[model samples]
Target: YRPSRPSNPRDDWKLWLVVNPGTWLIPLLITFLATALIVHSFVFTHEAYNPLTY
Candidate 1:
């Protein structure tokens, strides 16, 4: 069943905060950097190097 009235804009603002990137930019940056570091070690750095001797 539907409600009798529409949701208010104030409620929308609260919902927006739940998904807005600005609200968690610091965590986003940290996550991206961590992923980059992992990728670099496995694909770009010599730590995991292997020659095609097969």
Candidate 2:
């Protein structure tokens, strides 16, 4: 019987980053969500003073 080939060292180092999709998407999604939240809260037609204060 033939023996299987041994695993390459390069694969060990690069495996996690290449295998996990969230390694890239998580940071991008977080930044996008933060920017959108800031825009929605601060920039989207907020009245500075409440009518009850008048």
Candidate 3:
């Protein structure tokens, strides 16, 4: 499906959100941190966490 003109990168942000790395890892990383902190209670001290404020 080659195009005559050019592909619009700005329109393809959705593809990059999943196809790209690190960006997707963030959601799981946040989940991991939240689950860990709730169990570990690091958030109680001063070093804390969020949902991004849970």
Candidate 4:
């Protein structure tokens, strides 16, 4: 079966959000940073180190 094109720009955005590699990994990395900061407060200093939201 073939996939149909999105009817609107919002659907396109949804498709990209689901399939885009950079989109997924970037947020995952952010979550990792947040988890690290919360888990290891001493090691991951908020002032010394910045979160990876890239």
Candidate 5:
């Protein structure tokens, strides 16, 4: 039983952004930074454990 009024932004938020392109810039940048950090950490650990590096 969800609210019929839709408490906040509806499911089509992505389509709604078409008229407001800059609205997603900050969130997208933050997401990219988080993903890059996770990838960098895994790559660093893999390189450190590589037998050829010793």
Candidate 6:
């Protein structure tokens, strides 16, 4: 059972900006970083592993 209260933002105590970055920006960077690693490991490596080991 949950609290069936009204969806009042002020009453709900919104520190939204403090929690907002993790809501998308954090995950976006994680996916971007992971994809970059994969691209370097396989696609970009088509040029040769020398680019990475250097």
- Descending-TM-score candidate ranking: 5, 1, 6, 2, 4, 3
lDDT tens digits, residue span 1-54, model 1: 766654777466665557676777678899999998888667655644646323
Prediction 2 TM-score vs. true: 0.39
What lDDT score is found at residue 54 in candidate 5? 50
Each candidate's root-mean-square deviation in Å?
Answer: 7.9, 10.4, 9.3, 10.7, 6.2, 8.4
Worst 10 residues of 4 by lDDT: 45-54
**Model 5 backbone overlap count:** 0
Candidate 4: residue 1 Cα off by (Å) = 15
- Candidate 2 Cα misplacement greater than 4 A, ranges: 1-20, 48-54
Question: How much is the lDDT of residue 35 in candidate 1?
Answer: 94
Model 5 superposed RMSD (Cα): 6.2
> What is the clash count for each candidate, in the order shown?
0, 0, 0, 0, 0, 0
TM-scores, in order shown?
0.43, 0.39, 0.32, 0.37, 0.45, 0.42
Against the reference, the lDDT scores of all candidates come to 0.69, 0.67, 0.66, 0.70, 0.70, 0.70
Off by over 4 Å in 6: 1-22, 43-49, 52-54
Tell me how candidate 2 scores on lDDT.
Answer: 0.67
Candidate 3 has an lDDT of 0.66
Q: Is candidate 1 or candidate 4 better by TM-score?
A: 1
Q: Which prediction has the highest TM-score against the true structure?
A: 5
Model 6 lDDT per residue over 1-54, tens place = 677654666656455545576586788789999998987778666765555655
Candidate 2 lDDT over residue span 1-54, tens digit each: 887654768557666666675676687789999999878667444565434433
Report the Cα lDDT for candidate 4.
0.70
